[model samples]
Target: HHHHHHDFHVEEELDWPGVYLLPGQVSGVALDSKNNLVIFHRGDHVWDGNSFDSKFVYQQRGLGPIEEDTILVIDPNNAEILQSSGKNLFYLPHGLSIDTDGNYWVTDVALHQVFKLDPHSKEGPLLILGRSMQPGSDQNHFCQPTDVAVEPSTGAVFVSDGYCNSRIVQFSPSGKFVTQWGEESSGSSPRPGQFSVPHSLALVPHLDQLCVADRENGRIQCFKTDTKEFVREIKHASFGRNVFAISYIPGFLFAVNGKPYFGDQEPVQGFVMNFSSGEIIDVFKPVRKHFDMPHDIVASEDGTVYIGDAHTNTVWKFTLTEKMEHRSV
Candidate 1:
């Protein structure tokens, strides 16, 4: 008997949208309850290292919201737009996720807040957190917060306080602060429980673990949602010292690695790992080109993987194929 889980091939068939899309980057991607692909993108706004000040506040002086819709819904079967919304709302879109109740949760770095919205309704945010355009570390503040993960049964929310603060905050389904952990870190090597850029989140509810894509640290760090106790750190040098985002679907954990933290270019890639054992089982990469700047990733129940790349303005897809022979390393 053998297992071939380490094999995967890049899927390049989906006709990614361009006409309906405005001039900006694909900041985040998610799959809804029906497995429809939803994209959260930066529309008509550009964010660079210089976009934020040393104090980690947005410095783009007079920029207004993007006139084009920032969110797009596409039928994954045909890669056609199902609906479009989110115009004149977010300043700089970042993370996007969907809860079991079908509500969309997003983070806007420029606004320094998190929102819960009924995607089908025009009604303003069903709930909101963080002061508008203000960045701080208190329970009520978030400095460039990133992705969100929800516990399906309880609807508890988890946010990775990104770029600036490097912490993780958990809130009740109704937006009350439940608990938080992680300490701020600099460019130096960080100790466990310290994060340089806690950029994305995923909840392995079965494991009682909430995982953080500790971006600049190049690892996925997990902590208990209830007790806030450390779980395990998943890392490899192949991560290039920067794991940009992570997604968990069922028994697998997916991660995307970017440029090296200390040196020249590396083979940027997406990895699939066994959730229970932390064993990397598959790898994804473009056959001809490269993943220039992967911003977010999401997976569906039917064994599909989508990666949204900011620099390339493309959403990469990978499909699981027939089982191959498992080669022991």
Candidate 2:
């Protein structure tokens, strides 16, 4: 067996001693237009920077306090989920995404729903889609919607039906059920290409493709939008073995594993990659001084990467030492 080693660095000891933290599990992550880091704490609401270490659990949405659509806002500089100061929005917010217009789309797994929130506006969310309960009728209801992403060109939204029912549900810009797939699969799992725990999803607009964190199945499934066909499968023997939250940085996909529970031996938590070659190019465990069980990864335009550890209740930032330029045949 052979493995390619890469140089890595970490800035440890990120302790937010006095933050209002989520007692349950923390999952997804996103960057707002203002560069504020937003976190999705599974089974709970969103969490921003300051509030993250406050030693209490409070829901704050919008620009201030907890508004209608805003859930969590973070000041990456100091690593705090800002205090709304007053407002009430969110109902166990799961995954998050910001559109080109700067509006936010937040999903609630407990509620089985998605919301469109305008942070800058006090008007709250413009649309609400999905059900907050298990879909007994296979209608437009969801069991646990983990993540949401916008189709850059058409403004369509793709949501990952996590936990309860495994599938990818899509909706038009107007909040109409477009179509769905992944409930059944011909693969090893019960639903072959279908998802077991379709944890997180990312949309590659240029390719019009969706990459699913088909956790439990231990692989990332790529589906082409135009034809709705499985394109490729990227496997990770290590980091991806417990795939959790994922984000895309250009040609590469970064995912973290939330395994070994909280304190079970050396928590098998870190990252795996599916490079342009449709192969797992890298497998690295995050031993960053500030890393614990990283559930999510977010990348900046300048190539900076942020990994959020749910167990440690911290986020680690890093700069890629080298760049991978794209080449075509």
Candidate 3:
């Protein structure tokens, strides 16, 4: 058996002084340039076993855009809603990311598209990938792409084509298709370079690798950003369930797992791993203390963690501290 040298202590939630705010089910969460929290929510849309059919067709189809704003910018310290955008723009919001330039990179499963929205521009998105409202696996199409990772130095984008298509597609800075990799996978055993719902994506700059959380497989596989070369797989017995999301900051990797279905309850928690050690050394739960589903995660450089909860429609926060007497190997 292995032991840990580090630990994580659960903290409290941010204090929203005034008016309590309630958006729809939170699907994705990220931090903007000013460190403000950027949230992507699916207004009134719930993911259930009937959400999709055998052909990957969204069961709730032909519904108009969400009446409420899908994206919200809030103050992390006070939980104050500062700004809002993306009104009537998306039907099913999935992933939200911010590039080095503060541009928002997002994905919509219902629209089956990825977008690059310039925060300061008066116009709409600067670049968009995938056919509008159409789902396909071709070069110009995507079927329910989940998460996006941008190479800060090159603006290269990597998207995890989740749900319908089990693959990762690469695109140029201007949203041009470059290359793709991955294949359908089984729940327990999948070959390297294959995926079972590549649900999350993270760009580990120090490793020059793009890591994808193979959800159903309950493992993370990383690939070289440029060549699409299979690099390594990070998994441990501690991650007892499907890893729905992951975030990286320098030497540490943060991950979270949710129950597969409403009835399947192994454990709902997050993990902190020393990348070099590749084993989870610390575990944490939602600060709210009552989380229904943790969908996405974002770990800031300062060791602050944020989680998007779908069922409870909440954002969970946690602050980390070091333990003096660590576990021995």
Q: Tens digits of per-residue lDDT for model 3 on 199-286? A: 9998988668898998888899989887889989988766666888999988788888766455664677888887777778677775
Q: Each model's RMSD to truth, in Å?
A: 3.1, 7.7, 3.2
User: Which is better, 1 or 3, measured by lDDT?
Assistant: 3
Alpha carbon deviation, residue 306, candidate 2 (Å): 2.0
Q: Candidate 2 at 119: error in angstroms? A: 0.8
Candidate 2 TM-score versus the reference: 0.75
User: Which of 1 and 2 is ahead in TM-score?
Assistant: 1
TM-score, candidate number 1: 0.90
- Residue 290 C-alpha lDDT in model 3: 62
Model 2 Cα lDDT, one tens digit per residue, 77-190? 666667331134444556777777777777765456778876667665688887543332264777667778888788878888766677887889888888888874455444
Stretches of model 2 off by over 4 angstroms after superposition: 1-4, 7-25, 42-70, 80-87, 133-137, 184-192, 261-267, 272-274, 278-293, 323-329
State the C-alpha lDDT per candidate: 0.80, 0.62, 0.81
CA shift at 116, candidate 1, in angstroms?
A: 0.8
Least well predicted 10-residue stretch by lDDT in candidate 1: 14-23
- Deviation in Å, model 2, residue 121 alpha carbon: 2.2
lDDT of 1 by residue, 1-329 (tens): 24433454335444543323443789889998788888898876878887788887788746777778888887776678788888878888899998888888999998999989898897778999999888899999999999888898778899889788878888999999998888966455777798988998888867788888988778889888778888898987678768899988787888888854455566788888878888776677754345778889887768888888878777766665434653333
